[PDB]
Design a protein around this ligand. Structure first.
Ligand SMILES: Nc1ncnc2c1ncn2[C@@H]1O[C@H](COP(=O)(O)OP(=O)(O)OP(=O)(O)O)[C@@H](O)[C@H]1O
Lengths: 258, 96, 152, 304
């Protein structure tokens, strides 16, 4: 098995630029990795204080005085015990899938492979992180690995859900970078239509009161101004923390600020 | 050593004694002294290792006595190695 | 003040608003509406030095021990006087409002000695059952903090 | 036998290093004491590599002549008092054990083994539970528990030494007129001093270190340790001790412990939140807030 670590070009991910201009690994090598984790810093104050306290406890000697206790009680095991458990599990068990697990996995593969088509058609450029049959076999392997922990002789939907969630956290998150704006040929008319629609919406709707997506579609599209990409325009306006809020199961669109 | 170590202001004299003939640049001298004395490496439960050495960078205008400070550090250090620019290779600063 | 009132009333947006000035403040310390202090005059007069009244409404005092509540007010009455004196000195002499730089120098030394004496008395009498009437933290509506050392 | 810590289950260097008497007589907590010990071992004729081997695997020739080497060299460094006679018990092809090592193993088994009222109750329940662990080690069938006790004793003595050097280097001991105060508020592994026996270990270390000091005084000592979980100090009063090798002219009924009466007198007069419930009347549990005033009263209490 291969465990690899690397940095992007320019050092940081530089979320302002395209994903293809940030990852120098070709599609040939990136298809052989079951899980890819893109790691970023969020610079939050609470997390920074928690990490600072955790790191200072390590240096001042307060680490060991805690750790042994948990390793004693019920929550941690030593390296040698975990090594012996790993070797016992690998030499004793080799689980198998159930008929319902295959049905749940096939639909997830179809969904995650459909999404890539819409993303590639919208961005009019090929995806840097690929989704292939190896990505289905990876989820199968993760399901069986999860089953291996409990020495279970069969893998079921309980393990399938966790494997799917891990795959969504690892690879689908990396694929779905969702660029706010790249100023490329894709959405070229949108470069002005975004401001046009923002002005039309902010003149129609004062700082109070709300509207609906149904009305904001029907009436603003009867004039043939539809672009099929306005789904994320509302979210981008929401990102300003003032223009748009979504409430009531996403039905209600509320004007909250300038 | 133990007699002069208990005088107040020993740190100030140690800093002032770094590269005496160079005038000013007290922050550079403080950084050089801190790098020379160094920190303490650590190992937590034999599975987590923490480095204990200080690295220093000097970015400045030409003619500000950076190279002379490097030569002084080379002279004072117990074990020192010197390299410059294009005269070093990938395996000349590493194992071959 | 008259020019601002006329300008505000002139605007068609606020033609029907009623505005009246209630007080003039010379020095104001503002935390919230329930905690403030300073020096105010009801209305300015002519050729007579304006009469000023000193107000101090501090709800923060209510959560203190009975022995320290008078001290809180007494020390605020010194802070305000020192600030007024230094502001007058700065006005007379001629990023930072230099009217209030250096006011703490006048009342720092007495405050340190008073705090030391109060701490010594607290150490002496905190465990005395006779003085149990003092050093009692009051219970008030909206009180949540559970705190140990009254002088702190 | 010798006044050495666990000689037959550790090395010779370890026995000389972790001894209360040797530390008192040579001040091993700093560099000078370690250098003096190295010079002594060099003079005696034992290579430093050999003195660090296990007692069973130590050189036979050195082990045979240990008595003469001790007798002829120990006098120069003031350590001639480490030679004594004791009792050694052997059972078949097993190995020899001395009484001192046995009692240290038992004490180690007592110390470590296996909304604040419940927190104290659980601690007291565990302390009760350790009694049967120490009880089982007195049976000849259960020797693995005795070995475990020996290892625990070694670890505990190492921890005591580590805390004592920190106490002695930072000058935490405060010399008041009536007594000497030592309060441990910050540091690692303060969870070992919630047990009275470990605090008595550290107090015995400090008193032994002070007895051989050239300063001539017999003031009682006060040792206080914080528990963050309970937010209480555990406070113990310790009596002074004469030097081990001093003459018998001063020998009498030893110095009397007067902390019980003082604690009762202070507790009766004031409504302090103190707990005096241990069998030893010199150990109390006082809340964090009351420590600083209470001690002041003790200063004026007298009888100390
Ligand atoms: N206070 C000073 N500041 C700068 N230079 C000084 C000072 N005192 C003496 N010098 C002299 O000025 C000259 C310039 O120093 P130096 O050659 O180290 O400069 P540099 O630009 O840092 O060098 P390099 O490009 O080799 O790193 C040296 O001969 C040095 O001895």
């Amino acid at each position: 098995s291969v465990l690899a670590a690397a940095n992007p070009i320019y050092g940081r991910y530089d979320d302002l630029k395209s994903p293809g201009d940030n990852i120098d690994f070709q599609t040939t090598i990136l298809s052989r990795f079951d899980m890819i984790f893109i790691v970023k810093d969020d610079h939050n104050e609470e997390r920074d204080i928690s990490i600072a306290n955790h790191v200072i406890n390590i240096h001042t000697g307060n680490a060991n005085a805690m750790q042994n206790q948990q390793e004693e009680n019920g929550s941690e095991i030593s390296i040698e015990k975990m090594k012996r458990y790993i070797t016992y599990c690998r030499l004793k068990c080799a689980p198998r899938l159930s008929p319902q697990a295959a049905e749940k996995l096939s639909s997830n593969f179809v969904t995650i492979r459909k999404q890539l088509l819409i993303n590639e058609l919208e961005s009019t450029e090929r995806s840097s992180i690929p989704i292939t049959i190896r990505q289905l076999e990876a989820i199968i392997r993760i399901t069986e690995s999860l089953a291996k922990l409990e020495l279970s002789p069969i893998a079921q939907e309980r393990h399938v859900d966790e494997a799917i969630r891990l795959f969504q956290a690892s690879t689908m998150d990396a694929a779905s970078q969702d660029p706010i704006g790249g100023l490329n040929q894709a959405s070229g008319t949108s470069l002005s239509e975004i401001r046009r629609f923002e002005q039309e919406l902010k003149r129609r709707l004062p700082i109070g009161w709300s509207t609906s997506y149904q009305t904001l579609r029907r009436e603003f599209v009867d004039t043939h101004r539809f672009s099929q990409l306005a789904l994320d325009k509302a979210l981008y306006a929401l990102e300003k923390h003032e223009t748009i809020q979504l409430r009531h199961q996403g039905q209600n669109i509320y004007r909250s600020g300038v | 050593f133990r007699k002069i170590s208990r005088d107040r202001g020993i740190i100030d004299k140690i800093i002032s004694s770094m590269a005496p003939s160079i005038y000013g640049h007290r922050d550079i001298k403080t950084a050089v002294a801190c790098s020379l004395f160094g920190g303490v490496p650590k190992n937590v439960n034999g599975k987590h290792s923490i480095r204990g050495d200080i690295n220093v960078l000097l970015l400045g205008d030409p003619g500000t006595a950076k190279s002379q400070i490097l030569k002084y550090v080379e002279k004072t250090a117990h074990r020192a190695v010197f390299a410059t620019g294009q005269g070093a290779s990938a395996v000349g600063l590493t194992a071959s | 003040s008259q020019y601002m009132m006329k300008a505000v009333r002139t605007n068609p947006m606020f033609s029907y608003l009623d505005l009246n000035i209630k007080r003039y403040w010379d020095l104001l310390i503002w935390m919230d509406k329930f905690n403030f202090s300073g020096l105010a005059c009801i209305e300015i007069e002519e050729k007579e030095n304006q009469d000023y009244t000193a107000v101090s409404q501090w709800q923060l005092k209510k959560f203190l021990s009975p022995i320290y509540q008078p001290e809180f007010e007494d020390w605020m009455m010194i802070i305000l006087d020192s600030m007024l004196k230094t502001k007058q000195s700065y006005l007379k002499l001629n990023s930072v409002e230099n009217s209030l730089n250096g006011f703490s120098h006048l009342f720092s030394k007495p405050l340190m000695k008073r705090v030391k004496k109060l701490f010594k008395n607290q150490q002496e009498f905190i465990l005395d059952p006779q003085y149990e009437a003092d050093y009692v933290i009051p219970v008030l509506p909206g009180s949540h903090l559970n705190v140990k050392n009254p002088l702190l | 036998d010798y006044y050495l810590f666990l000689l037959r289950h550790s090395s010779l260097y370890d026995s000389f290093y972790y001894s209360n008497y040797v530390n008192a007589k040579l001040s091993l907590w700093n560099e000078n004491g370690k250098k003096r010990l190295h010079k002594m071992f060099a003079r005696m004729g034992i290579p430093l590599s050999t003195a660090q081997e296990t007692w069973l695997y130590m050189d036979h020739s050195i082990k045979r002549e240990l008595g003469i080497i001790f007798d002829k060299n120990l006098d120069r460094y003031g350590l001639q008092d480490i030679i004594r006679d004791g009792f050694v018990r052997t059972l078949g092809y097993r190995g020899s054990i001395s009484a001192s090592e046995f009692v240290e193993a038992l004490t180690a088994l007592l110390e470590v083994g296996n909304n604040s009222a419940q927190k104290l109750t659980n601690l007291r329940k565990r302390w009760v539970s350790n009694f049967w662990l120490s009880w089982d080690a007195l049976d000849d069938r259960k020797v693995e528990l005795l070995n475990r006790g020996i290892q625990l004793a070694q670890d505990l003595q190492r921890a005591i030494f580590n805390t004592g050097v920190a106490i002695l280097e930072k000058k935490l001991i405060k010399h008041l007129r009536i007594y000497r105060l030592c309060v441990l508020q910050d540091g690692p592994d303060l969870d070992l001093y919630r047990n009275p026996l470990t605090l008595l270990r550290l107090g015995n270390w400090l008193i032994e270190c002070c007895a051989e000091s050239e300063d001539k005084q017999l003031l009682p000592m006060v040792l206080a340790s914080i528990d963050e979980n309970t937010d209480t100090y555990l406070v113990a009063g310790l009596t002074p001790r004469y030097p081990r090798g001093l003459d018998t002219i001063h020998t009498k009924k030893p110095i009397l412990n007067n902390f019980s009466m003082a604690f009762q007198q202070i507790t009766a007069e004031t409504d302090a939140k103190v707990r005096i419930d241990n069998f030893e009347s010199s150990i109390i549990e006082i809340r964090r807030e009351d420590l600083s005033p209470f001690l002041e009263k003790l200063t004026l209490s007298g009888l100390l």
